[PDB]
Amino acid sequence: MRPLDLTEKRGKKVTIYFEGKELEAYEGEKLPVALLANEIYWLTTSNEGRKRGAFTFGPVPMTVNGVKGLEARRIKVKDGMKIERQGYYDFHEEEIERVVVDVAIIGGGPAGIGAALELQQYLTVALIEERGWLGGDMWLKGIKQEGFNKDSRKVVEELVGKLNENTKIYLETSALGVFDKGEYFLVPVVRGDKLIEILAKRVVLATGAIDSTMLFENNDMPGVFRRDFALEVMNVWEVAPGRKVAVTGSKADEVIQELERWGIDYVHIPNVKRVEGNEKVERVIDMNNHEYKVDALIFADGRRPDINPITQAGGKLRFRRGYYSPVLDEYHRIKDGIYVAGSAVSIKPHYANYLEGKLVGAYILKEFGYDAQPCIYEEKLREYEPESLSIPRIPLDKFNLEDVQICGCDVSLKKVDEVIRKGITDLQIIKRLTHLAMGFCQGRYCLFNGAVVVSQRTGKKLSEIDLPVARSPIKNVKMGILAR
Partner 1 sequence: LPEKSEIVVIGGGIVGVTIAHELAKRGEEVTVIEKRFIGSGSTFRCGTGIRQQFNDEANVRVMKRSVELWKKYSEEYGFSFKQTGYLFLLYDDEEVKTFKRNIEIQNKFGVPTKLITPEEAKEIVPLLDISEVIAASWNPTDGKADPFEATTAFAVKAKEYGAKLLEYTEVKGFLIENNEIKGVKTNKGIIKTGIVVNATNAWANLINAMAGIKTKIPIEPYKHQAVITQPIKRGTINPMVISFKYGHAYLTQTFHGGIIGGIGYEIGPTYDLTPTYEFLREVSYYFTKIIPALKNLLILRTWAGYYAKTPDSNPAIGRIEELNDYYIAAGFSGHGFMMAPAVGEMVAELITKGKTKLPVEWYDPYRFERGELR
Ligand X SMILES: Nc1ncnc2c1ncn2[C@@H]1O[C@H](COP(=O)(O)OP(=O)(O)OP(=O)(O)O)[C@@H](O)[C@H]1O
Ligand Y SMILES: Cc1cc2nc3c(=O)[nH]c(=O)nc-3n(C[C@H](O)[C@H](O)C(O)COP(=O)(O)O)c2cc1C
| Residue 175 binding target from ligand X, Fe ion, ligand Y, none, CB below 5 to 8 Å by type | ligand X
List the one residue from 7, 15, 428, 463 that touches partner 1 (CB under 8 A).
Answer: 428
| 129 sits near ligand X (criterion: CB under 6 A) | yes
User: Which of 33, 62, 123, 175 is close enough to bind ligand X by CB under 6 A?
Assistant: 175
Residue with Cβ nearer ligand Y (160 or 438): 438
Nearer to partner 1 (CB atom), residue 374 or residue 473: 473
Contact call for residue 473 and ligand X (CB under 6 A): no
| Residue closer to partner 1, measured from CB, 72 or 156 | 72
3-state SS, residue 89: coil
Whether 52 and 60 have beta carbons less than 8 Å apart is answered as: yes
Q: Does 195 bind ligand Y (CB under 6 A)?
A: no
Nearest approach in angstroms of CB 188 to ligand Y is: 19
What span, in angstroms and rounded, lies between the C-alpha atoms of 478 and 456? 38
Nearest CB to partner 1, comparing residues 162 and 471: 471
Residue 139: DSSP 8-state: G
**Beta strand pairing status for 296-299 and 224-226?**
parallel
- Please tell me the distance from the alpha carbon of residue 278 to that of residue 42, in angstroms, as a whole number: 10
The response to whether 432 counts as a known ligand-binding position is: yes
Is residue 283 classed exposed, middle or buried when 0-12, 13-18 and 19+ CB atoms within 10 A define those classes?
middle
Residue 131 labeled ligand binder = yes
Q: Is the Cβ–Cβ distance between 60 and 32 less than 8 Å?
A: yes
Using CB under 6 A as the binding rule, whether residue 438 contacts ligand Y is answered as yes
Q: What's 179's DSSP letter? A: E
CB of 358 to ligand X, least distance (A): 12
**Residue 181 touches which member of ligand X, partner 1, ligand Y, none, C-beta under 5-8 Å by kind:** partner 1
| Single-letter residue type at 28 | G
Report yes or no: 169 and 134 within 8 Å, Cβ to Cβ.
yes
Q: Which stretch binds ligand X (CB under 6 A): 254-262, 323-331, 336-344, 424-432?
A: 336-344
Q: Which one of residues 8, 93, 371, 397 is an interface residue with partner 1 (CB under 8 A)?
A: 93
CA-to-CA separations, 60 to 20, 40, 403, 421, in angstroms, rounded = 19, 14, 20, 32
Q: Considering only residues 452-471, where is the footprint of ligand Y by CB under 6 A?
A: 468-469, 471
On whether 175 is known to bind a ligand per the annotation, the reply is yes
At closest approach, how far in Å is the CB of 111 from ligand X?
3
User: What is the C-alpha separation between 388 and 399, in angstroms, rounded?
Assistant: 26
Which segments of 235-300 does DSSP mark as H helices, in order?
252-262
Question: Cα–Cα distance between 56 and 224 in angstroms, integer?
Answer: 6
Binding mask 349-378 for partner 1 (x = CB under 8 A): -------------------xx---------
User: What is the spatial distance between Cα 48 and Cα 58, in angstroms, rounded to a whole number?
Assistant: 14
343 touching ligand X, by CB under 6 A: yes
Q: Apex CA 285: angle with CA 280 and CA 288, to 5°? A: 175
**Eight-state DSSP code of residue 463:** G
* Among Fe ion, partner 1, ligand Y, none, residue 480 binds (CB under 5-8 Å by kind): partner 1
Minimal distance, residue 285 CB to ligand X, in Å:
32
Write the DSSP assignment of 189-214 as a string of letters. Answer: EEETTEEEEEEES-EEE---EEEPPP
Q: Give the Cα separation of 480 and 194 in Å (integer).
A: 10
Nearest one of 438, 391, 479 to 195, comparing CA atoms: 479
Q: Which of 58, 109, 249, 337 binds ligand X (CB under 6 A)?
A: 109
Q: Is 353 annotated as a binding residue?
A: yes
Query: What does the alpha-carbon distance between residue 112 and residue 117 come to, in Å, rounded to a whole number?
Result: 9
Known binding-site residues for ATP equal: 111, 129, 131, 137, 175, 207, 303, 343, 350, 353
Known binding-site residues for FMN equal: 431-432, 438, 442, 471
Where on the chain is the footprint of ligand X (CB under 6 A)?
Answer: 106-112, 128-131, 136-138, 174-175, 206-209, 309, 342-344, 350, 353, 474-475
Where on the chain is the footprint of partner 1 (CB under 8 A)?
Answer: 47, 69, 87-94, 98-100, 102, 124, 176-177, 179, 181-184, 186, 188, 199, 314, 368-369, 409, 426, 428-429, 432, 435, 438, 440, 442, 471-473, 476-484
